[PDB]
Design an enzyme around this catalytic site. Structure first.
Site: not given
Ligand SMILES: CCCCCCCCCCCCOC[C@H]1O[C@H](O[C@H]2O[C@H](CO)[C@@H](O)[C@H](O)[C@H]2O)[C@H](O)[C@@H](O)[C@@H]1O
Ligand SMILES: CCCCCCCCCCCCOC[C@H]1O[C@H](O[C@H]2O[C@H](CO)[C@@H](O)[C@H](O)[C@H]2O)[C@H](O)[C@@H](O)[C@@H]1O
Ligand SMILES: CCCCCCCCCCCCOC[C@H]1O[C@H](O[C@H]2O[C@H](CO)[C@@H](O)[C@H](O)[C@H]2O)[C@H](O)[C@@H](O)[C@@H]1O
Ligand SMILES: CCCCCCCCCCCCOC[C@H]1O[C@H](O[C@H]2O[C@H](CO)[C@@H](O)[C@H](O)[C@H]2O)[C@H](O)[C@@H](O)[C@@H]1O
Ligand SMILES: NC(=O)CN(CC(=O)O)CC(=O)O
Ligand SMILES: NC(=O)CN(CC(=O)O)CC(=O)O
Length: 901
Positions: A733, A742
């Protein structure tokens, strides 16, 4: 340290460049092999003497001025047939004309033939002694052309077939060259015996160890490639420095078997990693690091064991040392290049074929029974081993003789019959080679000076015992410079054991003013070689022990285990040596094995020490490295010793047998040195594989307990980061220390931690400031990233434990696999992961392979393969391997489920 990083990198590299790696090296090895079959024609017999000694100097100056002694080159006993006598002039005229014809056709090879038969009517007593008094036998001397031992031998072998045809075949050849031809001829038939006997037996042991042919054939192929390339290297070496006959069998005797041994540990580790759910790419890597470290270390160790032989001046030992180095180094390189790439291409396809391809807890329970009664096993072992060193005191040394061949060898007997029929002619006198630094002649009174000083010395032969006639001048032939500045006098020796004593006394004699005296002769050459050995031998042992123990210390990390191994190897050595003197000096087994009890060759003792020590040290590394691996893995000394034994039990037996088989082919050599060397292997190996590996090592090692393992030198070995769930998801991640958007466009930070879905950055900074309890203006440290990550994990774990579909599988998983499960939860949420009803059920039942296979068929694997494959591999193996060596970096960051605040 530095060593653990490179093997990892090379592990990923052999896989990335499989086809290129396997193409280049095989081409080189076969290219070397084709280049190296010519080795045998660029090969020398010389190198048993000390090149820097006075005797060699005396020889050099002697052959220079007086001409080399060719009188003993070829000696041929002649026997007229039908009980006719040598004096039969009809038989004489026919035989001599045959001889003249052989010389006529081979003036480039033969100087001529000398003997009574050339002038039968002579009252010359020595010449008339070339016939027996019963007139049934007469011998001739056949000096050969050539200016070194090798050219002269080649010349003999050219004329021998026609020479043997003289007197209707009733002629018996002997002398220096017929023996040399026979002694060197043993090499060719020793390797043929290896091809006929050793090779099929190796395949059997190879297939015994493994279960399939492909896995069995690969170490064999490596060995062959190692031989080929090493012979090619040795051929290349022959272009710059002499390479001895004996270097060739050493390549097959030592290099082959050891190359098979290395290949055995690589294939076995690869098979072992595939047994676990490791990818082919992963298996090659892990295999390469572990095995390679042991194999690479094992090779260097033998190199470290062979290099000290370069301290000895015998060119014999230098050629062999090179051959050993070339062999075991190419073996190590091949076992982590060609072999590794092959396994990377094959993958699990190694276990394809089975016995049926026709066209044309023993160690577990053997090791623990020892452990709780180790002393009951130690004490009796060590007593015998020390008692096996007691025949060592009888060890004696000598030069090459006809007795180096078996008693029933025709050439040895021709010699033994020459000495029986003509007892006086075979001499080995000591020489006084006198040289004026001044360039003017030596006067007769100056020789009278030296003779007077020489006659002073006690035990020289006096047949015809006037002192005046003692110390005759060396015979001068047409090859000599006849420089009056150099004169040589020589006398035989009375009682010939005491040469060292009388040689040193000849050198103590003060040379008449202005001359350098060079004391030489065959016993002088042999004695100087022997003294040279004993002189550089304590130094050899020092370098031998230090370098290997240090290397084992870098391989193990322990300081004690290597020192333990030193004592083990020393006792294995001393025991093996004692048995050998028991065998080849005291002659036990001499009848069974058809060899003559006799002194051993001096440089042979150097070679056998190095080979045994290096081999003994390797078999400790083969075994202990696994024990070490176990401990590093984290286990009690007890089971660490056991795990290492049971894992390598079948492997080391097979490794031992394969080497033992090849050695057992060479024990049937007509050459005693070869017999002696080959037996050294067998005995030391058998002692290593049984008495040492199975009993003495695990027994001792427990006595130390955890003291055996790393003791001193704290921080010598670096504790390393122990992988964790953060590092796992730091990879999957990402780890971002500053607020970022993101893929969904939301403000995220740390490890996939969603701050807010608000378009406002300040709102995200506000929530981040709130979350860290500190004004961040969008930036956090690594510690705070983990702190936030741990809250998210705690949240993830909490919800997992409240989920009826997730709690049971999670509760049954170990810490590592739990992290993989949490990883999934982060990526897709509980409901997402709970949808995997079957694979979860498979994980709860520890059916890793089934779960790994089923999880790969998911849409989850399809949309995110690299992370899924990473998580799946973690489920399958239960280790951090897929993350500890991940490919690259990831580009698309996505916030995870369970962001806690
Ligand atoms: C695989 C095992 C094979 C074992 C082969 C051994 C078989 C018999 C060995 C044959 C040796 C021939 O010996 C005869 C020669 O000995 C010395 O010269 C030899 O020693 C010198 C100093 O080293 C060198 O300079 C000379 O080149 C070198 O000919 C003498 O000076 C010569 O007058 C004599 O002719
Ligand atoms: C490990 C293997 C060991 C094998 C041991 C073998 C040793 C063999 C030793 C052989 C010694 C034979 O020597 C034979 C003789 O030849 C020459 O005679 C001369 O007679 C005629 C008149 O002069 C002329 O034709 C020539 O000038 C010349 O032949 C020497 O002048 C003699 O002094 C010497 O005695
Ligand atoms: C992948 C694994 C690789 C492992 C391979 C290991 C192989 C190591 C081979 C080392 C051999 C080095 O050779 C060393 C020898 O070379 C020299 O030659 C040169 O001096 C000769 C006179 O001495 C003259 O003929 C010439 O001027 C000249 O050629 C001499 O003969 C020796 O003084 C020297 O000691
Ligand atoms: C511990 C694990 C097991 C490892 C050991 C494996 C050994 C495999 C290789 C064995 C092959 C047997 O080869 C037999 C060899 O002997 C024969 O007769 C000779 O026998 C003795 C010398 O060879 C003496 O009796 C005489 O000189 C002569 O009669 C032939 O002359 C040779 O051509 C033949 O090659
Ligand atoms: N773990 C899974 O992928 C199971 N899936 C797929 C399957 O194995 O049929 C169905 C289920 O929810 O039981
Ligand atoms: N986003 C990426 O580039 C990395 N991928 C990895 C993959 O495609 O398997 C997804 C993820 O780790 O979340």
């Amino acid at each position: 340290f530095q060593s653990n990083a490179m093997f990892a990198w090379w592990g990923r590299t052999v896989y990335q460049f499989r086809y290129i790696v396997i193409g280049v090296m095989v081409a080189l090895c076969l290219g070397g092999g084709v280049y190296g079959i010519s080795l045998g024609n660029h090969v020398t017999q010389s190198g048993f003497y000390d090149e820097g000694s006075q005797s060699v100097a005396a020889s050099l100056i002697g052959d220079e001025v007086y001409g080399r002694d060719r009188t003993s080159h070829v000696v041929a006993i002649l026997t007229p047939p039908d009980d006719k006598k040598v004096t039969d002039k009809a038989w004489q005229k026919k035989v001599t004309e045959e001889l003249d014809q052989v010389v006529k056709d081979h003036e480039d090879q033969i100087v001529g033939w000398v003997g009574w038969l050339k002038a039968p009517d002579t009252t010359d007593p020595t010449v008339s002694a070339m016939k027996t008094q019963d007139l049934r036998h007469t011998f001739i001397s056949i000096p050969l052309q050539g200016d070194d031992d090798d050219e002269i031998l080649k010349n003999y072998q050219v004329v021998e077939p026609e020479l043997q045809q003289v007197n209707g075949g009733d002629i018996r050849l002997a002398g220096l060259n017929p023996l040399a031809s026979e002694l060197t001829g043993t090499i060719g038939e020793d390797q043929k015996r290896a091809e006929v006997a050793a090779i099929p037996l190796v395949a059997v042991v190879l297939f015994f160890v493994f279960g399939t042919v492909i896995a069995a054939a690969l170490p064999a192929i490596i060995g062959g490639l190692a031989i080929a390339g090493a012979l090619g290297i040795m051929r290349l070496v022959a272009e710059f420095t002499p390479v001895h006959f004996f270097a060739q069998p050493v390549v097959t005797l030592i290099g082959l078997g050891i190359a098979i041994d290395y290949g055995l540990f690589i294939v076995s580790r690869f098979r072992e990693e595939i047994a676990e759910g490791y990818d082919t790419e992963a298996a090659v890597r892990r295999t390469v690091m572990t095995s390679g470290r042991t194999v690479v270390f094992s090779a260097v160790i033998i190199v470290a064991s062979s290099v000290p032989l370069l301290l000895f001046p015998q060119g014999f030992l230098k050629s062999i040392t090179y051959a050993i180095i070339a062999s075991v180094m190419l073996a190590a390189i091949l076992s982590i290049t060609v072999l590794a790439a092959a396994l990377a291409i094959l993958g699990p396809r190694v276990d394809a074929l089975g016995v049926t391809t026709l066209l044309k807890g023993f160690w577990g329970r053997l090791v623990n029974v020892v452990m709780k009664r180790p002393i009951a096993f130690a004490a009796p072992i060590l007593v015998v081993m020390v008692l096996l060193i007691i025949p060592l005191g009888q060890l004696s040394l000598g030069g090459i003789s006809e007795k180096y061949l078996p008693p029933d060898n025709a050439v040895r007997q021709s010699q033994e019959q020459f000495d029986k029929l003509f007892p006086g002619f075979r001499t080995e006198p000591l020489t006084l080679v006198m040289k004026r630094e001044d360039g003017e002649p030596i006067t007769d009174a100056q020789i009278a000076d030296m003779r007077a000083k020489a006659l002073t010395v006690s035990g020289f032969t006096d047949p015809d015992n006037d002192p005046e006639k003692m110390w005759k001048e060396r015979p001068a032939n047409d090859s000599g410079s006849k420089d009056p500045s150099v004169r040589v006098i020589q006398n035989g020796l009375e009682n010939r054991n005491d040469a060292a004593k009388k040689i040193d006394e000849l050198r103590a004699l003060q040379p008449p003013h202005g001359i350098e005296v060079f004391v030489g002769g065959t016993p002088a050459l042999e004695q100087d070689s022997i003294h040279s050995l004993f002189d550089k031998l304590p130094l050899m042992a020092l370098i031998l022990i230090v370098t290997t123990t240090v290397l084992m210390f870098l391989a193990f990390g322990s300081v004690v285990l290597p020192i333990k191994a030193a004592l083990m190897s020393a006792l294995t050595l001393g025991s093996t040596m004692g048995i050998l003197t028991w065998m080849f000096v005291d002659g036990h087994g001499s009848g069974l094995m058809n060899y003559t009890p006799q002194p051993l060759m001096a440089p042979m003792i150097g070679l056998i020490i190095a080979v045994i020590w290096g081999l003994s040290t390797d078999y400790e590394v083969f075994l202990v490295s696994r024990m070490v691996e176990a401990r590093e893995r984290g286990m009690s000394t007890a089971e660490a010793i056991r795990i290492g034994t049971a894992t390598t039990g079948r492997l080391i037996t097979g490794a031992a047998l394969i080497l033992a088989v090849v050695a057992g082919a060479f024990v049937f050599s007509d050459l005693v040195m070869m017999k002696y060397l080959a037996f050294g292997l067998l005995i030391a190996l058998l002692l290593d594989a049984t008495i040492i590996r199975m009993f003495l090592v695990p027994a001792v090692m427990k006595l130390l307990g955890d003291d055996c393992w790393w003791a001193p030198r704290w921080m010598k070995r670096v504790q390393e980061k122990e992988f964790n769930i953060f590092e796992m998801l730091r990879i999957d991640e990402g780890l971002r220390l500053k607020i970022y958007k993101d893929t969904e466009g939301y403000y995220t930070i740390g490890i996939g931690h969603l701050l807010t879905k608000s378009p406002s950055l300040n709102a995200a900074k506000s929530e981040l400031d709130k979350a860290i309890g500190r004004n961040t203006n969008g930036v956090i440290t690594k510690d705070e990233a983990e702190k936030l990550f741990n809250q998210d994990v705690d949240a993830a774990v909490r919800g997992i434990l409240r989920n009826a579909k997730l709690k049971p599988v999670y509760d049954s998983l170990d810490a590592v696999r739990r992290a993989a499960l949490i990883n999934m939860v982060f990526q897709m949420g509980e409901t997402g992961v709970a949808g995997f009803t079957n694979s979860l059920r498979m994980l709860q039942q520890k059916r890793w392979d089934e779960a790994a296979v089923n999880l790969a068929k998911s849409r989850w694997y399809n949309q995110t393969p690299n992370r899924a494959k990473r998580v799946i591999t973690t489920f399958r193996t239960g280790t951090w391997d897929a993350y500890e060596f991940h490919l690259g970096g990831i580009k698309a960051f996505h916030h995870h489920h369970h962001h806690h605040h």
